[PDB]
Each structure stands twice: as structure tokens, then as C-alpha cells.
Amino acid sequence: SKENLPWVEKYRPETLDEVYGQNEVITTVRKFVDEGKLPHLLFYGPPGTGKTSTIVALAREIYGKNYSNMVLELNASDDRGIDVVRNQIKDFASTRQIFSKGFKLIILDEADAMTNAAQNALRRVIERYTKNTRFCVLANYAHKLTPALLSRCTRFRFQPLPQEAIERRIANVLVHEKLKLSPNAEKALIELSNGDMRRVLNVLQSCKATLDNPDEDEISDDVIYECCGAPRPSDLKAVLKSILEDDWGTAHYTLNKVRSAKGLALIDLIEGIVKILEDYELQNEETRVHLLTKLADIEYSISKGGNDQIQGSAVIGAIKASFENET
Amino acid sequence: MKLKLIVNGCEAPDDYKLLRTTINTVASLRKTAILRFNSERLTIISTPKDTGQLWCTIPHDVFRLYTVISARELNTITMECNCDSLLSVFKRYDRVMNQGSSSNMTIKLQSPICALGITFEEIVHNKVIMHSFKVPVKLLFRAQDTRIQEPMINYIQLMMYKLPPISGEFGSAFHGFIRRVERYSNVNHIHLMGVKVELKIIVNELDWHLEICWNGPLDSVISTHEVIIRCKDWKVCSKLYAAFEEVVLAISHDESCVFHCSLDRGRERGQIIYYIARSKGL
Amino acid sequence: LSLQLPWVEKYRPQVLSDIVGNKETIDRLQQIAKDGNMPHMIISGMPGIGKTTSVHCLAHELLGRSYADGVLELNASDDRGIDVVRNQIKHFAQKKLHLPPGKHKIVILDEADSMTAGAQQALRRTMELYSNSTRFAFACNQSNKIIEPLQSRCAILRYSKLSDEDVLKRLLQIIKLEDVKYTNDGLEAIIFTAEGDMRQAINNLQSTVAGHGLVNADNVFKIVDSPHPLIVKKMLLASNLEDSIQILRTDLWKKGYSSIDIVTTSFRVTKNLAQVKESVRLEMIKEIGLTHMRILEGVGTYLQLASMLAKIHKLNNKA
Amino acid sequence: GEQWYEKFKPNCLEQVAIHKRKLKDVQEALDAMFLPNAKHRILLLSGPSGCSKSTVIKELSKILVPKYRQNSHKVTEFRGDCIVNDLPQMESFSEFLKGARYLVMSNLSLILIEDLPNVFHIDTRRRFQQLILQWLYSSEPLLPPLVICITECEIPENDNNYRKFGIDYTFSAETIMNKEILMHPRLKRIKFNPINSTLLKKHLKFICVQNMKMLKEKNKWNKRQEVIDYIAQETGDIRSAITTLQFWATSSGSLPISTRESTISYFHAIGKVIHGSHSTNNDNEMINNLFENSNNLLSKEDFKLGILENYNTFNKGEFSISDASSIVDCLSECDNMNGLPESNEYGLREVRKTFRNISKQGHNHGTVYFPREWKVRKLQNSFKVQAEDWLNVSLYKYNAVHSFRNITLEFGYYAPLIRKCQSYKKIDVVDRIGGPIEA
DNA sequence: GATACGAATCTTTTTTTCCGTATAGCCGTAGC
DNA sequence: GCTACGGCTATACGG
DNA sequence: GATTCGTATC
Ligand SMILES: Nc1ncnc2c1ncn2[C@@H]1O[C@H](COP(=O)(O)OP(=O)(O)OP(O)(O)=S)[C@@H](O)[C@H]1O
Ligand SMILES: Nc1ncnc2c1ncn2[C@@H]1O[C@H](COP(=O)(O)OP(=O)(O)OP(O)(O)=S)[C@@H](O)[C@H]1O
Ligand SMILES: Nc1ncnc2c1ncn2[C@@H]1O[C@H](COP(=O)(O)OP(=O)(O)OP(O)(O)=S)[C@@H](O)[C@H]1O
Ligand SMILES: [Mg+2]
Numbered sequence A: 001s002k003e004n005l006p007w008v009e010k011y012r013p014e015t016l017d018e019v020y021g022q023n024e025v026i027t028t029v030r031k032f033v034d035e036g037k038l039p040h041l042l043f044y045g046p047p048g049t050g051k052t053s054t055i056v057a058l059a060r061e062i063y064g065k066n067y068s069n070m071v072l073e074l075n076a077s078d079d080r081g082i083d084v085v086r087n088q089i090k091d092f093a094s095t096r097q098i099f100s101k102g103f104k105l106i107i108l109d110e111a112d113a114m115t116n117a118a119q120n121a122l123r124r125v126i127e128r129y130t131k132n133t134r135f136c137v138l139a140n141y142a143h144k145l146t147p148a149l150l151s152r153c154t155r156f157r158f159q160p161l162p163q164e165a166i167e168r169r170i171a172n173v174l175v176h177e178k179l180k181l182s183p184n185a186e187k188a189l190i191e192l193s194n195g196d197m198r199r200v201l202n203v204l205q206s207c208k209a210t211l212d213n214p215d216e217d218e219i220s221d222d223v224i225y226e227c228c229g230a231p232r233p234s235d236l237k238a239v240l241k242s243i244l245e246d247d248w249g250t251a252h253y254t255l256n257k258v259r260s261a262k263g264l265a266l267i268d269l270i271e272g273i274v275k276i277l278e279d280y281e282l283q284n285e286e287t288r289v290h291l292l293t294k295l296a297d298i299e300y301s302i303s304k305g306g307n308d309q310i311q312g313s314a315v316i317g318a319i320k321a322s323f324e325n326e327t
Numbered sequence B: 001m002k003l004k005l006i007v008n009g010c011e012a013p014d015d016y017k018l019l020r021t022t023i024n025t026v027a028s029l030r031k032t033a034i035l036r037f038n039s040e041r042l043t044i045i046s047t048p049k050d051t052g053q054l055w056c057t058i059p060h061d062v063f064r065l066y067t068v069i070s071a072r073e074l075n076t077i078t079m080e081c082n083c084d085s086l087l088s089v090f091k092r093y094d095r096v097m098n099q100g101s102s103s104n105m106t107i108k109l110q111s112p113i114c115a116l117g118i119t120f121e122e123i124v125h126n127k128v129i130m131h132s133f134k135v136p137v138k139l140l141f142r143a144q145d146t147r148i149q150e151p152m153i154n155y156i157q158l159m160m161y162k163l164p165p166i167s168g169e170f171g172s173a174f175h176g177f178i179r180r181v182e183r184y185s186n187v188n189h190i191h192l193m194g195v196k197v198e199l200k201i202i203v204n205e206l207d208w209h210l211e212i213c214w215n216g217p218l219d220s221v222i223s224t225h226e227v228i229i230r231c232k233d234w235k236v237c238s239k240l241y242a243a244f245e246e247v248v249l250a251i252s253h254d255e256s257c258v259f260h261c262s263l264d265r266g267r268e269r270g271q272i273i274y275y276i277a278r279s280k281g282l
Numbered sequence C: 001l002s003l004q005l006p007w008v009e010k011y012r013p014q015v016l017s018d019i020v021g022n023k024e025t026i027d028r029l030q031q032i033a034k035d036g037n038m039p040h041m042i043i044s045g046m047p048g049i050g051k052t053t054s055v056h057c058l059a060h061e062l063l064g065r066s067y068a069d070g071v072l073e074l075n076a077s078d079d080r081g082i083d084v085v086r087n088q089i090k091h092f093a094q095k096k097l098h099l100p101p102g103k104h105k106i107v108i109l110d111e112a113d114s115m116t117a118g119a120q121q122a123l124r125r126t127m128e129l130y131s132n133s134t135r136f137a138f139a140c141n142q143s144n145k146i147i148e149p150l151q152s153r154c155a156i157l158r159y160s161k162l163s164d165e166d167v168l169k170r171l172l173q174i175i176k177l178e179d180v181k182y183t184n185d186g187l188e189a190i191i192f193t194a195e196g197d198m199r200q201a202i203n204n205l206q207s208t209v210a211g212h213g214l215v216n217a218d219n220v221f222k223i224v225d226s227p228h229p230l231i232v233k234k235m236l237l238a239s240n241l242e243d244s245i246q247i248l249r250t251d252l253w254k255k256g257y258s259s260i261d262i263v264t265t266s267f268r269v270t271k272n273l274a275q276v277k278e279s280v281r282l283e284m285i286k287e288i289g290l291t292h293m294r295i296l297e298g299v300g301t302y303l304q305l306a307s308m309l310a311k312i313h314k315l316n317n318k319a
Numbered sequence D: 001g002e003q004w005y006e007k008f009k010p011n012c013l014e015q016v017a018i019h020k021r022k023l024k025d026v027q028e029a030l031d032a033m034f035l036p037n038a039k040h041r042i043l044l045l046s047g048p049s050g051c052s053k054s055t056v057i058k059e060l061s062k063i064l065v066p067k068y069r070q071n072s073h074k075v076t077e078f079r080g081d082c083i084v085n086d087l088p089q090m091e092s093f094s095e096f097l098k099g100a101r102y103l104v105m106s107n108l109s110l111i112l113i114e115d116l117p118n119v120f121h122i123d124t125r126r127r128f129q130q131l132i133l134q135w136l137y138s139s140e141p142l143l144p145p146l147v148i149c150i151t152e153c154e155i156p157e158n159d160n161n162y163r164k165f166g167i168d169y170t171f172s173a174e175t176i177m178n179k180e181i182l183m184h185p186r187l188k189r190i191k192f193n194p195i196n197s198t199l200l201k202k203h204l205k206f207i208c209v210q211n212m213k214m215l216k217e218k219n220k221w222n223k224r225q226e227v228i229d230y231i232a233q234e235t236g237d238i239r240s241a242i243t244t245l246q247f248w249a250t251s252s253g254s255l256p257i258s259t260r261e262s263t264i265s266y267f268h269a270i271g272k273v274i275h276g277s278h279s280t281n282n283d284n285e286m287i288n289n290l291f292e293n294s295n296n297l298l299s300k301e302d303f304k305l306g307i308l309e310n311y312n313t314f315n316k317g318e319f320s321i322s323d324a325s326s327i328v329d330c331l332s333e334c335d336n337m338n339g340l341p342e343s344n345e346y347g348l349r350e351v352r353k354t355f356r357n358i359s360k361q362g363h364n365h366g367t368v369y370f371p372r373e374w375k376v377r378k379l380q381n382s383f384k385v386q387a388e389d390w391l392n393v394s395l396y397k398y399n400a401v402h403s404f405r406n407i408t409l410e411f412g413y414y415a416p417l418i419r420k421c422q423s424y425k426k427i428d429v430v431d432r433i434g435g436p437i438e439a
Numbered sequence E: 001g002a003t004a005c006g007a008a009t010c011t012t013t014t015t016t017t018c019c020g021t022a023t024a025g026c027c028g029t030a031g032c
Numbered sequence F: 001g002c003t004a005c006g007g008c009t010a011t012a013c014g015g
Numbered sequence G: 001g002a003t004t005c006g007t008a009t010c
């Protein structure tokens, strides 16, 4: 019943060739498998980069039918304390293989949430029973892992998804769901994805839901911005132009009108203005400092909440004061 | 402050069994117990002050001799004693007759912290072996005794169920019904059911349900009555039901549960009351 | 089929002569092995520089045939509670095993830094009771985790970080044993990425050979990444804010490094940053701490890191 | 074949590395404790590891026990690893004490508790407390002398939780014994100090000349003096010094001499942060080593309070108010970082930089003190009890719900004044709650 | 006799795991 | 031959 | 680490 599933858990890759983006890691692990030697892998990267899918497809490729007993997967949902590591992991990586020979695979999903004592006990299991067992460690934060564990694990870095991988996955989704996507909407979707496939899948599902009749109807950038509630680039450019050139009253009026036209959030406008101003050429190096600092505290205050109009006026005043240094 | 009493188990069986059951119950409930020696009755109290309270009344005619004298009102001598020492003394005295004897158990208050000189005899087979014991107790003050009172029970929604006597045909079946919920290891709350006669033991949880029901004949002495209580108190209720023929169950809607046990000595009747608060709300 | 031991364990040294690095310490271990009178010792240092293998080789050359029932290797993977220490260590120490006149039983306690304090006191009692028949060897990362009374009876040996020359020698031995193609630039890149870790060097070399074959700088830097502490140090030491921002973005944000990792690395680098003033160092520490608090509270965007870099540059160039 | 610290153990009192005053006031206490009616019941010895605490008691028992023993020599040491079949673990020490209580007349033997039972488990720690409390309060007409030696060591961090207790941080007599045991009339405490350089040098020289042939064979005899001085300078542990000397002598190469590193005390760390450390002019290196070696003490709110309390003792308070304002502002800023390591690092670095910039020769500093925050907490607890009493009497004789906020603001001073005139001119509470406010 | 050295003082009340005890359940043997 | 009770053991709790 | 008082040694 794959039609009764969210799009994120509907297009999970089943084979290694279905994982896009991380070509180097996929080729390296495939060479490892074909050569017959697999070290203690360690997968590191931002969420949604395809670490769990890659390791699951790798385990399926290695053990086609014996995946149930040749693979032991533990994650943050199960207790992974000192006792679990001492007993269950040792018992799994202490017995002989059933009939598949090869080696036993132990996957530690989100190992950054494990305690330090658990990792200290796990390092000796890893370096002791490595003849017949290989460990895989998946984590988004490397600072929460013991340096010895990183030392005994071969580190693989999962980069954020490039453009072409997003295009290929979106094309596959469109072919499967019989959907149409405008190139402008395609560009908008990749920009908001931020190297995340789950965000792309969720936004595509929401856009298909947004259409009154899914077939014979294209998904435009307007549909994307209406479904996800993000400001259009034209709105951001107009707001920045009004703040930079116009006086205070009309800039405030323009910001209020732009925000009230579609119900836009101030934090999204702040992120858009930050992204646009990064492309600007500033010749003072004090405008950069003022902009970054003032916008950082404004974003933090928005994260803690407060008066929204005061925060918007603060954004306008901060930008104006920072650009007064460029004289 | 002159307290002295003599107990003969073989002379009067029923009241000695009542005393032994009270001692066992107060020992199983919690450590230490309150012995209130009023001039006409002895009350054994186990006050944890949610957890239940046991209020057993023992008449003065139970013991062969009941000299109780103190400067307080109605010669009220109140004392706190460890149940384990008293339980061990009572087990020794019970084994004394079990091996064959009829000797009396003499108890005197020999000296605020005092001790009872519980001494009795035993004869193996025509030898004299004197068993002497001294259980350290503390003497509760008069105001501290006044701070302990039996909790009154409202009768606005309280409904009585006359549980069948265990000596009858339905007594063993009802005992099995009561202990049917005790064989589950992972049970902490029992939610009772009475609609207006049926007694239903319902244990509802996240992923399992239990519907023990009593289909036998029952009497209510003379409307839904639900109260959820802990399993440990239900064990005490089951233990009390086995040792008492006249057992009365009172259920209050979302307020409390009362387990009344009575021993018809007729003569003043010995009664045991176990007040149980609801563990949580319906 | 898949049967091939990883090069980390396939080439684990079995004798003290194959251990590179601390030449003086290895020579002392050889002298102890040839003498026999091994005292209580504590071995500490960075991970993967040859602490566990040195102790195992010393025990093997000190007992030989009696290694099967003359050593007791307990680690963090095994239970090491006060009851376990009591029972097992007392029974092993009391055991009367006949040995050469200069030979003693060895109790190898790997990962001794993760042992409970009550077990440490039990170890004190066992050492004071049975020091004439058995000896205790401690392997740890830092000696501070072992209590002072335990360290009082032990001869502390400190393992320094492996030099580039010793790592190169062991690596070249492995190339000559495996007969794989290599380039001097590739070996230099492997050493540079290893950062004094021998196990990391072996893992990176094995991955490079198994993924690309010939070991050059291009393949190595295409499979493994440059150490992010060095990238963070370069970012913090930039002159102007634009270069630091560009380095931060294109080397930590486009590469897929978490912001909390960047903040922790910046804190460590600032703690170990030379050629800077104390006031500047403490101001950057305070700024990194404020950024760390903001990241922990939930605001983990690139804007916070950019603001941290801007404030660091503002304090660097003053006002 | 044997360890040097074991084969060269003292045979008499003259070979024990101990100060003359320490030997004298331990001898006097032990001799007084062997009297038929001894004022002191037990003897408590505290100090760092390898401070001749255990051995001096043995050599004293070799000369005191045979003298006071009746007619019809060593200590009766508790052994914790003994596992008896019918003995629960918490009852082992109780059984040991009950058995050792029968050592008074014609069976006299000193009792030496060198290794205590497992005190890191709370139940047996409380059992130990109430077991040694009963010994001091025992109604026994005469008891054998009891000697307890506790090694003052810092327990390293093992598990991550903010329910860390006193025993979890450091292993000292204060964390083990409570206030009742320590402040007892029948308890005598003799704290110990690390062995000085002079005794260490003398004993290392004696050990060296006891093995003269082996150092002369390895040509290390000419270099033995500098090794002895350097070892005595580095550490104060006699066992560690002898072990290091044996390791150096048995060596055949140029291996550098290393010894165990002693932890830095609380007031030692306070002085290091305030006045700096000699032989280390780099503040960054000193702070980094202090944080790496003593992170347990540094990562505590007690240390920041100690700095705030003792930063005015740099020159008896004779420094610019700008420096004090900067220090207290930095401490207030660090208090808002929720205990991050960066907060402690920044605070210590700023304090050290501030005190380094104004440092001058000839400065006469003051004496540092522990923070008084615990006294303030105790006074607040007393105020809470008195306010609870006031609210109880005000809610029992009549119906009046007043908030504790109003009790502290106005009712803590106005209401006692009302009850004063009302009573003298003619309710229960007449004095100001928490006492009067002075200055 | 001047000085280096040494002693005394400057002090305290959520989460995971582990160590030992409590307790209920079940099996084996004495007695009715 | 059957039941009761004491001893042994596995599991939850507590600090 | 700092201050203050008391000894042993040069
Ligand atoms: N490279 C990829 N190719 C195709 N689909 C992908 C890729 N990366 C992610 N996805 C999709 O995103 C979903 C979630 O990715 P996962 O790999 O399960 O999670 P993850 O990448 O490990 O991130 P974290 O760190 O575990 S939250 C997958 O089920 C796929 O549908
Ligand atoms: N000096 C060395 N010479 C040769 N191989 C070495 C050396 N040091 C480490 N290795 C290799 O490192 C691997 C095992 O190193 P270990 O000694 O177990 O690590 P470690 O030094 O004990 O650090 P930790 O704290 O235990 S993670 C094996 O593959 C060894 O060949
Ligand atoms: N001259 C000496 N003076 C003192 N101890 C000596 C001497 N020569 C050898 N030793 C040994 O040095 C060791 C010192 O141990 P102690 O200090 O007596 O024990 P301790 O005080 O309890 O230290 P901890 O806390 O148990 S590690 C003993 O094993 C002595 O035998
Ligand atoms: Mg995942």
C-alpha cells in the first residue's frame, strides 16, 4: 500500500542506484561491496541528505534475503544505554553467521544521541569483533561522538543535495504522479529545499493538494509560494528598494502592505533580505558588521517572540543605519 | 501506667485467631503499629499519616485478664510497637501449641519508651522451657492520641455489598473471584463496578482490558458505584475475606472503598475495618 | 562472499619491534619484556597511537605460552562493576600460577578511564593485597580519570602524538606488504589528513585503495576531507570579514557541517590559538559562547555564524 | 624482584617519612586513646595519597599495642572484598565492627580502617554513618582504639547528570562523614600534609645507597642527585617517588622522568586565577591546564562565587574601581550563559587579565575566604520557617490570607511592631521575622 | 643571626546507571 | 498421596 | 597560591 503513504516515505530508495547526489560515497561503498571488504562506515551530514536510505539499500544489496537476521538496526527510539550495548550488541556481534558468511552489519542510527559510556563500551566491541561484524554510524552532529569512535570509524561526508539530484528526483516524482511543474516553480522549489529532499517532497505533495484538479493543471511558482507561505522574490526586492531608497513612512507602509497582502512572516522577509544583501558589494566593512549583528539579534528576538510591528520597524531602522555607513 | 494482660489461645480459639489476623494484617501493611488500650476494648491502628488505614476493635473479654490503669481518660494507654517483633512472638506462641501445650501468654508493661514483658511457657516431650521476650515500644502522648481518629464515611452514595461467607457453597468461588486479579504481575489499579447485584473487576490500560465478573448470588444489605484502587490494598482485602465469615464491602462513587470484617462473638463483636482511598479519579 | 580483514586489524603489530612512534617508550617496554619485572603502569595518550597494541605485545612477549591463563583483559565492553572487580580480580590475583623467576601475571584493564570509583578503591585494595604475584596495566586516554591512590602505585608512561616520519614509515611498510600503487603527494595528503592518528591513516589509505586504486592527492582529497579544525582556524584568523565569511560558507555550510559543530570547533581552536592577545582571546571566547547559547536555544541559522564572525572581526580590528 | 617501596618499607618509627610535629601529635593522641578512660574514642586521619598515613599507624601499633595489652602486636585491618556466604554486603562492616569490639582486655588490637566500605552507594554510606555514630555514642565501658584513614582525592567525572553529590565530586572526610561525626567530642582529627622535599630527598638517597652496586653498574650513580632533587620537587608522594626512582634506575635509556599529577585545591585554584602561577608566565597555558586537569572544580557555581568573594583580596582592596567593575560585570555576563564551558573560560581569562594588567611588585595581598552564600541560604530557611509560623497563626486565630511576598516586604517588620505595642500596652510573634536588618 | 623551609589556614548545602536489598512466586519435603 | 510452609530465586524499586 | 608564625640550617 505505497499509495497510502506520505511522499517522504513513498520515494525512499530501495537500491543504491536510486540514491542521487552523493555519487562519490555511493561509488566508494559499491567498490567496497564488489571487492568484498567493508570497513566500519561512518555517515555524516545534514538531515535529509540520504544517509539512512543509503545504508539500508547497501544492507539490502549485501544481504538480499537475509536482511532480517544479518542486520541489527538501533536508533534513538530504542534504549541504547550501557546495558543494551553490553548485552544485546555483544550477543549479536559474538555469534557466528547463520549461513550467509560475509559479515554481520550493525547500524547505529543517530548515534550522536548515545551516551559517552555507551560509546566507550562500543569502541572495544567494534575493534574486537571486527573479523565477522562491521559497524555503521549515522550522525548529524560529530561533536557528540567520542574521538576514539571517530578514529576507529571510516568517515563519509554526506553533502547537501546539489541541483541536478533535486531535478532528477523531482522529474521521477512528476513522472510517477502524472504532474506538471513550471521551470520557475522548479527553481523556487530547489531554492527553498536547502539541500533537503524531504522538504521538496512535502512541498510537492502540498502543491498537488493545492491544485483543484491535479491533472491538466501545472504547478507554478505562485502555487508554491501560496502553499508554503513564502515571500516572492519580487516582494523582497520591492521591500529592500523601499527600505534603502524611500523615506521612513512610505517604507513602513510598503512593508506593512507587502506583509498584509499574503500574510507573510517577518522572519521569512529577514532571511530573504539577508540572502539578497550577501550578493551586494559593500566597500566599508562596517555596514556588513552592523547588518549581520542587528539582523541576528532581531531574528533571535523574533524566535523568542514579541511585538511584530516593533520588530519590523527595527529591521527597517537597522538596514537604514547600517547603510548610512556607506555614506 | 499499669498495663497487664493474659492470652490463652486454646481456651478461646476465635478471638485468638482474630488477634493473630490483626497482627498479620498490620505487619503486612507497614512497619510499626498503634495499640490503643482503652479500658473496655483494645484498638489496633495502622495509620500511614492515599494508603489505607486499618481500624480493628478487640473487646476486653478477648483476653483472660485486662487490667488497664493510667492517669489519662478512661485509662487510655497508647503505644507504638514494631509489628515484626510482636509477629515473631506470636509465631513462637502459635508453634508452642502446635507442638502441643495449653500454656497462657502473660503480657506486662515493664518500664517515654517502654517494653512489654511477653512471657509464656512451653513443654516438650515434661520439661519447663520459659520463653521470655521484651519488645521495645514508645508511649504515645495524650494529644498525639487525639491526633489519630477513625475517618467517618459518608452514606450519600455509599452502597453496601454483603459478600458471601467463605464457609458457604459460594464462598470458595467468591474467594477465587477476588484473587482472580492477583495473578497478573503488571497490575497496579483495579477499577470496581457495581450497578443497581454484580461485582465487576475491570483493569483497563493502554493495550489490554480485563472484565472479571461475578455471576453468583450476592446480597446487598438495606445506581452505579465505581472506584479505582491500588492492587496492594486488594491483596489485604482478599486476606481479610478468607479469615472472616461476615464480610461487608462498601463502595463509594469516586470517593473511597470500605472493607468491613465482623466476628460475631455472641458479647461485644470484634470488627476489622480497612478504609481504602481511591488511587486516582475515574 | 565477503571475507577480508580490514587493514587496521590485518596489520595490527604482534611484536614490540613493529610499533612506531614513541621510540623511548617502546625501548623501555622492550627492556621490561626482556627483564620481566614489569611494574604497575598507566599508559595515556591520544586515540590510535599504539596504547592497546603495545600492552598486548608486552604481555605476549612477557608470558608467551602462559598468555592463555596468565592475563586477564577487561575493558569497557565487559562489565567492570565493584562486584565483578571483587570476584574476578581477587580470584585471578589469588591464583598460584607457576611462572619463570622474573615473570608475573598481568591484569590488562583497557579503557580504565570509564571505571566506577568504587571499582577503583577495590583495585587499590587488590593491589595492596596481591602486588607480589600479579601486576596491573592501565590503558586510558587521560590519566586524570584514574584516581590518585591508583596512580601512586603505577609508573606513568605518556604516549605522544605520532610524528609524520613514523606514520610514513609504517604506511610505506603497509604499501610494500600489500603492493598497491602510490604517489608521494598522496602519502603526504594521507599523513596530513590523519593528524597524527595511525588508525585514521590506515583507514583512509585502505578506503583510497579500495575506491580509486592509485593513491594521489586528487583521489585522497576526493574521498576524504581536510580536517575541519584547520578550516575553522583559517576562518578565525582571516584578516577581513569578507574572506572569513566566504571561507565559512563555502567550506562548512556548502560542505554539510552542522552549526553546533562549527561553534564547538571554533571554541576549541580559540582555546588552542597562538599569536593572539589574551584580551582578544577572551573576547572571542565570550562571543563564541553567546553564539553557542543562541544555537542551543534553537536559532541555528547561518546568520548567527555570520554575526559571530562579524563581531570577532570587529573586536580584532577594534573601534 | 620486589617493588622498591615494598622491599624498603620502614622497620621502625625513625624510617617513616613524617614531620616531627606530626609524629609527636599522632603519638600523643594514640597514647591517650589507649588509656582506660580515653576522652577521644576514634582517630581520623585525612590527607593526600602516599602521606605515610597507614604505615605510621602500623609502626605505632608495633610499640603501643604490646605495651597496653594485658597478660594471659599489630592492627586488625578491615578487608572489604571478603564476601561471606551468609552476609549481605551492607552488613559486612557491621559484622566487622561487632567482632572487633571484643579486643579490649588480653585481646587488645588497634583497628585500622584504611579501605572503607563502598560509600558511593548511598544506602551503605548511610549505614556506615550510623554505624560509626553508634561507636562514638556507645555505652560500652571500654572499647578498642579505632583509627580511620581517609585519602583526600578528587573523584573524576563518570556519569552526566546535575544530581552530583559531595561524594560524587570529591572523596574527602567532609563528604563521607556528616556534621555529627566530624564535630564530636570523642573524635580526634589529625590532617596530613604531603611529604616535604627534605624527607623525600633523604629517603631517596637512602634507597639509592641501599642499591649502590646497581646504580654504579649502570653508571647512573653520578646522575642520581639531580634525579632525587627533581623527583622530590615534582611530587610529595613517597610511594610515587620511590616507584619513579625504581623505574628510572631499572631503565637503560634516556626516558624522561614522569610522576603522577596532584590535583589543585579550591583555594589553590582561586589563588592561581587571582594572583597567577609562578614558572608559567603564559596565562593561556595556565588556564588551559587548569581547565584540563581540574574541570570538576572549575565547572561549578561555587568557583565563580569564590572569585567574586576573593577578588578584593588582591591588594587589600587597593586597586581601581574600574577593574572591580569589569570583573563583576564579566561575572554577571557569565552567570547568564547557563553553565556553558565558554562562560567559565571567559570569566577566568578576564579575571586573570585584569589582575595581570594591574599587578605590581611589592604588593601585600589579603586572605581569601569561602563564599558566605550557604549562611545566607540558612538565614533564608529560618526566615521561611518563621514566615510559615506567622501565616499559620494568622490563618488559625482568624481568616486572613497574606502572601509570602507581603510577609517579606511589610508584614515582616510592621506586624511585629503592631504585636509589640498591642502586647506591652495591654500576638505570639513579637520579634522581627528573620531578625533585624542592620546597616 | 639571616634566611629558606615547613605547617596552618583560607570551606561548603531530566536522564542514566549501578549496587545492593525487598518481595512475591514457585518447588521440595514433612505431616496429616 | 495431597497440601502447607520454608527456602531459593528472579524482578522491580530506591537512592 | 597567598599570609603568618615557628624552626633548622648555613
Ligand atoms: N539522495 C537521495 N535520493 C533520493 N531520495 C532521497 C535522497 N536523500 C533523501 N531522500 C529522500 O528523503 C527521505 C528521508 O531521507 P533519509 O535518508 O531517510 O533521512 P536522512 O537523510 O538520514 O536524514 P537524517 O539525518 O536521518 S534526519 C528518504 O526516504 C528519501 O525519500
Ligand atoms: N605505533 C604504531 N605502529 C603501528 N601501527 C600502529 C601504531 N599505533 C597504532 N597503530 C595501529 O592502530 C590500530 C590499533 O591502534 P590502538 O593501539 O588499538 O589504538 P589506541 O592507541 O589504543 O587508542 P585508543 O585509546 O585505544 S582508541 C592498529 O591498526 C595498529 O596497527
Ligand atoms: N621511608 C618511608 N616512609 C614511608 N613510607 C615508605 C617509606 N619507604 C617505603 N614506604 C612505602 O610507601 C608506602 C606509603 O603508603 P602510605 O602513605 O602509608 O599509605 P596511605 O597513606 O594509605 O596512602 P593511600 O591513600 O593508601 S594510596 C607504603 O607502601 C610504605 O611501605
Ligand atoms: Mg535517518
Ligand SMILES: [Mg+2]
Residues within 6 Å of the ligand: C051, C052, C053, C110
Ligand atoms: Mg585500544
Ligand SMILES: [Mg+2]
Residues within 6 Å of the ligand: D053, D054, D055, D114
Ligand atoms: Mg596505606
